[PDB]
Amino acid sequence: ASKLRAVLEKLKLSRDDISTAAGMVKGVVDHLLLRLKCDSAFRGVGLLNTGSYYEHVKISAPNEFDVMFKLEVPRIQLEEYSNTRAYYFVKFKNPLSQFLEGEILSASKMLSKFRKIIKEEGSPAVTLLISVDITLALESKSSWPASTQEGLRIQNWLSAKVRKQLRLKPFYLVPKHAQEETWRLSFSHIEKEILNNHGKSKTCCENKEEKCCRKDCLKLMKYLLEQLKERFKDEEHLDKFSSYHVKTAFFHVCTQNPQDSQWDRKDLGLCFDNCVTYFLQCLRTEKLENYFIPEFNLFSSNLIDKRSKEFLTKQIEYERNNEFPVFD
Numbered sequence: 001a002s003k004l005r006a007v008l009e010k011l012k013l014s015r016d017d018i019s020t021a022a023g024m025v026k027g028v029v030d031h032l033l034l035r036l037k038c039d040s041a042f043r044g045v046g047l048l049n050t051g052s053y054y055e056h057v058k059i060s061a062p063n064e065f066d067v068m069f070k071l072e073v074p075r076i077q078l079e080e081y082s083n084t085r086a087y088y089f090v091k092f093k094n095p096l097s098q099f100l101e102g103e104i105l106s107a108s109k110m111l112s113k114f115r116k117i118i119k120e121e122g123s124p125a126v127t128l129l130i131s132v133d134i135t136l137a138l139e140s141k142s143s144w145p146a147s148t149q150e151g152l153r154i155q156n157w158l159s160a161k162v163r164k165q166l167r168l169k170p171f172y173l174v175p176k177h178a179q180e181e182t183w184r185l186s187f188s189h190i191e192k193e194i195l196n197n198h199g200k201s202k203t204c205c206e207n208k209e210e211k212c213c214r215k216d217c218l219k220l221m222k223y224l225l226e227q228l229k230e231r232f233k234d235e236e237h238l239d240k241f242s243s244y245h246v247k248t249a250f251f252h253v254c255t256q257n258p259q260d261s262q263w264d265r266k267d268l269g270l271c272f273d274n275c276v277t278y279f280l281q282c283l284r285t286e287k288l289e290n291y292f293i294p295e296f297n298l299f300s301s302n303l304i305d306k307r308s309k310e311f312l313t314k315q316i317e318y319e320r321n322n323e324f325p326v327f328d
């Protein structure tokens, strides 16, 4: 209870120092974006909005930032790869013809040029050095792919109006490989909008009478994983897990507990325990549905070994029964 709020305060004091570092990262980005704009192939490159840096996977490592460069392109048509609901080949119907390999757009070819232009100056295409990961993403203004039709189950939490409005925004495709020329769907912009506008009430966390602990629970779940990943970094059974798994599980708990009253700031310990319990259930049953693509199991044996899940299950059960020693 009091231990949880002490961790958040230590995290908060850690964030203030990078306020000056933000402009330092934001300077390198504003430059690199201009240099990429001079190449004919990257004319329509820009920052993925709502903030230059998305502050990486690590809540406990403010030294490393994460930035996404979106590439506006003509109308995209997609071909699903091998029944994997998230990976696709990209096809056309001007300057990107150089990266064409028949009809399929070559991720390896565009990444190689993306890297060459920056060097002289693929989930992260380049990592600069205080680290900065840069991801190239294709912007598509088409309707969201069919695999997202039963995802984003926010209707009883953020309303069906908002889900309708959110699904009118573009989606994004990042060169991730399953096959070395597929692209992976990305909804980082939607995830940020949900986190920063998270309550059933439109004025959640806008006044002191409506302070919920939704954000604090996510910070704590991210800190728990990073601490465990750092403690057991040499054991290799936690390499697969990332903050995306914790964020995904958190969004399911929001769907599961849609009322702001279920996230009262004075129930932080119970609310954090709700997220820990749901994340364990996903580990034990090896089922963590992608929040936007319900058929993509993030905890499938294809992606993460069963022994890794029960290792993490074992460690989280330990921390839970010992009142989380890795926090102090």
Ligand SMILES: Nc1ccc(-c2cc(Cl)c(Cl)c3[nH]c4c(c23)CN(C(=O)CO)CC4)cn1
Binding pocket: 057, 086, 184, 185, 186, 187, 242, 243, 244, 290, 292, 293, 296, 298, 303
């Ligand atoms: N093996 C994996 C893991 C996950 C996915 C994945 C899948 C979908 Cl559909 C979406 Cl929308 C995704 N967004 C992100 C990921 C992702 C993975 N990811 C990280 O793990 C951060 O280090 C970036 C953020 C596909 N393959």
Ligand SMILES: [Zn+2]
Binding pocket: 198, 199, 204, 205, 210, 211, 212, 213, 214
């Ligand atoms: Zn709130």
